[PDB]
Each structure stands twice: as C-alpha cells, then as structure tokens.
Enzyme design. Structure first.
Site, PDB file in Angstrom:
ATOM      1  N   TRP A 179      -0.106  -8.664   4.833  1.00  0.00           N
ATOM      2  CA  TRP A 179      -1.309  -8.023   5.429  1.00  0.00           C
ATOM      3  C   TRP A 179      -2.502  -8.462   4.607  1.00  0.00           C
ATOM      4  O   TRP A 179      -2.425  -8.401   3.371  1.00  0.00           O
ATOM      5  CB  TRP A 179      -1.162  -6.501   5.443  1.00  0.00           C
ATOM      6  CG  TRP A 179      -2.244  -5.763   6.187  1.00  0.00           C
ATOM      7  CD1 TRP A 179      -2.185  -5.277   7.465  1.00  0.00           C
ATOM      8  CD2 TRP A 179      -3.536  -5.408   5.683  1.00  0.00           C
ATOM      9  NE1 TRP A 179      -3.351  -4.648   7.782  1.00  0.00           N
ATOM     10  CE2 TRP A 179      -4.203  -4.719   6.717  1.00  0.00           C
ATOM     11  CE3 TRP A 179      -4.202  -5.609   4.474  1.00  0.00           C
ATOM     12  CZ2 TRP A 179      -5.499  -4.217   6.557  1.00  0.00           C
ATOM     13  CZ3 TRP A 179      -5.477  -5.119   4.314  1.00  0.00           C
ATOM     14  CH2 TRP A 179      -6.115  -4.412   5.337  1.00  0.00           C
ATOM     15  N   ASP A 225       6.778  -5.926  13.993  1.00  0.00           N
ATOM     16  CA  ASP A 225       5.902  -5.374  12.950  1.00  0.00           C
ATOM     17  C   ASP A 225       4.702  -4.735  13.627  1.00  0.00           C
ATOM     18  O   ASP A 225       3.970  -5.465  14.290  1.00  0.00           O
ATOM     19  CB  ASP A 225       5.474  -6.460  11.967  1.00  0.00           C
ATOM     20  CG  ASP A 225       4.818  -5.913  10.723  1.00  0.00           C
ATOM     21  OD1 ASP A 225       4.180  -4.832  10.832  1.00  0.00           O
ATOM     22  OD2 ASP A 225       4.928  -6.597   9.666  1.00  0.00           O
ATOM     23  N   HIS A 271       8.084  -3.702   9.908  1.00  0.00           N
ATOM     24  CA  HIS A 271       7.302  -3.944   8.687  1.00  0.00           C
ATOM     25  C   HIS A 271       8.129  -3.585   7.448  1.00  0.00           C
ATOM     26  O   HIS A 271       7.832  -4.136   6.413  1.00  0.00           O
ATOM     27  CB  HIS A 271       6.021  -3.125   8.713  1.00  0.00           C
ATOM     28  CG  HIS A 271       5.054  -3.548   7.670  1.00  0.00           C
ATOM     29  ND1 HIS A 271       4.441  -4.793   7.700  1.00  0.00           N
ATOM     30  CD2 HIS A 271       4.575  -2.884   6.596  1.00  0.00           C
ATOM     31  CE1 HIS A 271       3.611  -4.865   6.670  1.00  0.00           C
ATOM     32  NE2 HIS A 271       3.688  -3.716   5.972  1.00  0.00           N
ATOM     33  N   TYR A 321       0.848  -1.207   0.000  1.00  0.00           N
ATOM     34  CA  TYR A 321       0.000   0.000   0.000  1.00  0.00           C
ATOM     35  C   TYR A 321       0.880   1.252   0.000  1.00  0.00           C
ATOM     36  O   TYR A 321       1.812   1.316   0.790  1.00  0.00           O
ATOM     37  CB  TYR A 321      -0.887  -0.048   1.232  1.00  0.00           C
ATOM     38  CG  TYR A 321      -2.008   0.948   1.240  1.00  0.00           C
ATOM     39  CD1 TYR A 321      -3.109   0.795   0.422  1.00  0.00           C
ATOM     40  CD2 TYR A 321      -1.963   2.045   2.082  1.00  0.00           C
ATOM     41  CE1 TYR A 321      -4.158   1.697   0.453  1.00  0.00           C
ATOM     42  CE2 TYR A 321      -3.009   2.958   2.133  1.00  0.00           C
ATOM     43  CZ  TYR A 321      -4.109   2.768   1.323  1.00  0.00           C
ATOM     44  OH  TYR A 321      -5.136   3.645   1.357  1.00  0.00           O
ATOM     45  N   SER A 365       3.549  -7.000   2.338  1.00  0.00           N
ATOM     46  CA  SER A 365       2.455  -6.282   3.040  1.00  0.00           C
ATOM     47  C   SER A 365       1.164  -6.615   2.304  1.00  0.00           C
ATOM     48  O   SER A 365       0.894  -7.815   2.188  1.00  0.00           O
ATOM     49  CB  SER A 365       2.753  -4.788   3.105  1.00  0.00           C
ATOM     50  OG  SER A 365       1.893  -4.060   4.029  1.00  0.00           O
ATOM     51  N   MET A 366       0.396  -5.643   1.791  1.00  0.00           N
ATOM     52  CA  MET A 366      -0.823  -6.023   1.023  1.00  0.00           C
ATOM     53  C   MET A 366      -0.412  -6.830  -0.216  1.00  0.00           C
ATOM     54  O   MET A 366      -1.195  -7.650  -0.658  1.00  0.00           O
ATOM     55  CB  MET A 366      -1.641  -4.803   0.580  1.00  0.00           C
ATOM     56  CG  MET A 366      -2.476  -4.210   1.694  1.00  0.00           C
ATOM     57  SD  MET A 366      -3.383  -2.822   1.031  1.00  0.00           S
ATOM     58  CE  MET A 366      -4.089  -2.151   2.543  1.00  0.00           C
TER      59      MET A 366
END
EC number: 3.1.1.74
Length: 257
Positions: free
Chosen positions: A155, A175, A207, A60, A130-131
């Site tokens: 994520w 994270d 993260h 993101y 992540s995403m």
C-alpha cells in the site's frame, strides 16, 4: 564456486516448509535502539557460514508478530531476518522506509555478537506487508546497494519508485485494503523498465494472506532473496517458466532468467 551459495538443491515442496537451518530469535526492546521500535531477529545456528540480512516491516496497526512465521521461514532457509516494530503503530509507508533503513544500519553495526557472526553486512534486502511494502519500495529507491525488495500486498499513495533494486511484488486477488489495480500493479508498471521485476497475484487471497503461513509467499520470497542476495541461480527455476495454480496473474520483464 558461488561463495554465497547455501543449503541443498531446492524443491518447490521444501520451499513451503522451514528450511535446513535451525533458528534463534533475539527480541530487540523498543528503548534499546534509535530510529525504529525494536522487533525480532531470526538467524541461523549450527553453522560457521555468513548470510545476507533482510529487514522486514509490518503494516498499519500491526506489529512484528504479524510476520513472525515469514521471518522464521526465511531465516530457516539461510538469512539473518529483522522484523521491525515501528515507533508508532500508525506510522505511514515513508516512515516505515526510514525505520527499515535504521534497522539495517543497526543490524550491520550494533546487533548482538551472535547476529553479527551470521551476517554478511554487504548483502542486504528488504520486504514488508501493506504500508510496510510501500516502505520496502521507498527504501529500495533510496538505497541501490540493496540486493532485493519484496513488497507483500503493498500500500502506498505514491505509485512510482525509481529503484534499480530487483523487485518481486505479491498481490492478493481479493485484496480490499490495497486493491492490486490501485497499488501492487501500478507499483510494478511504474518501476524502471531496466530494473528486474516480477509481479505475482495470489488466487482468492485477502490483504491478510501474508500474516499466516502461505506456500506461494514462501516460495516466491525465498526464491527472489536466494537469487539476488546469494546470486543462487538454483532458484531461477521457481521464477522462470512458472506453472503454479496458486497464481492468477504474473508479469515480468524477464531480467532474472
């Protein structure tokens, strides 16, 4: 006798640095492609052989540059690696899954000649941050022909991915964006018990550990891709009987050993 075997006998130290293949880059303009925002391809030169293809998604607000070191690192060990840009920086994990799928179709069908010359179109894998790691889990669920999936500090609001694709998840102990107790470790637990799976947790990492050169991410990502994309059992040694002070947790069902 393994036709997909590439490169010398690996050492842990060698997997913390760019490998034996010189790397080219090709920049994909956003407008040149449908279904994703372009990105950067990293691929070998100085070779007549072909290699598996990896599509990788950033997270993101982030772009392909957030994983440039790892695309280069993977390609330098013998992979064709496309790190996407997304249609929007604000795309969600399932949108990033769709964009990885478009990117892999592009890679196999309409990429430049020099990229097509280095790609084994039948040996494909995914990774992401992540995403982009949630997207990695979703595309694996949707495409069981994928050889491997490596979600990095992943994520996702959905916690269960019904994939048969071998998954290695990297969690970051510190994270605060995708805490491992709510994202990485549930993803690992909810994968089918019959799917080869590994979870590794980086001691003290944030993260954004995946967005800078990271010895453990390099070792585990290269090793999982080599084992599953290339059937290269010379890499089991890094994933079996592991002793690595960079890791603060390790879970597996031992289906890779």
């Amino acid at each position: 006798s393994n036709p997909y075997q590439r490169g010398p006998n690996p050492t842990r130290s060698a997997l913390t640095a760019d490998g034996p293949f010189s790397v080219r880059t090709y920049t994909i303009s956003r407008l040149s492609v449908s279904g994703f925002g372009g990105g950067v391809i990293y691929y070998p030169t100085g070779t007549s052989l072909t290699f598996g293809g990896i599509a990788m998604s950033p997270g993101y607000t982030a772009d392909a540059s957030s994983l440039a070191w790892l695309g280069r690192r993977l390609a330098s060990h013998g992979f064709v690696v496309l790190v996407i840009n997304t249609n929007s920086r604000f795309d969600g994990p399932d949108s990033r899954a769709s964009q990885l799928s478009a990117a892999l179709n592009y890679l196999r069908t309409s990429s430049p000649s020099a990229v097509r010359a280095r790609l084994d179109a039948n040996r494909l894998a995914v990774a992401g941050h992540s995403m982009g790691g949630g997207g990695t889990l979703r595309i694996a669920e949707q495409n069981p022909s994928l050889k491997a999936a490596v979600p990095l500090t992943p994520w996702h609001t959905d916690k269960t991915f019904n994939t048969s694709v071998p998954v290695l998840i990297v969690g970051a102990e510190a994270d605060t964006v995708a805490p491992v107790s709510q994202h990485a470790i549930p993803f690992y637990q909810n994968l089918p018990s019959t799917t080869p799976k590994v979870y590794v947790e980086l001691c003290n990492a944030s993260h954004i550990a995946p967005n800078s050169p990271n010895a453990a991410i390099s070792v585990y990502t290269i090793s999982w891709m080599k084992l599953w994309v290339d059937n290269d059992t010379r890499y089991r040694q890094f994933l079996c009987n592991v002793n690595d002070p960079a890791l603060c947790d390790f879970r597996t069902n031992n289906r890779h050993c």
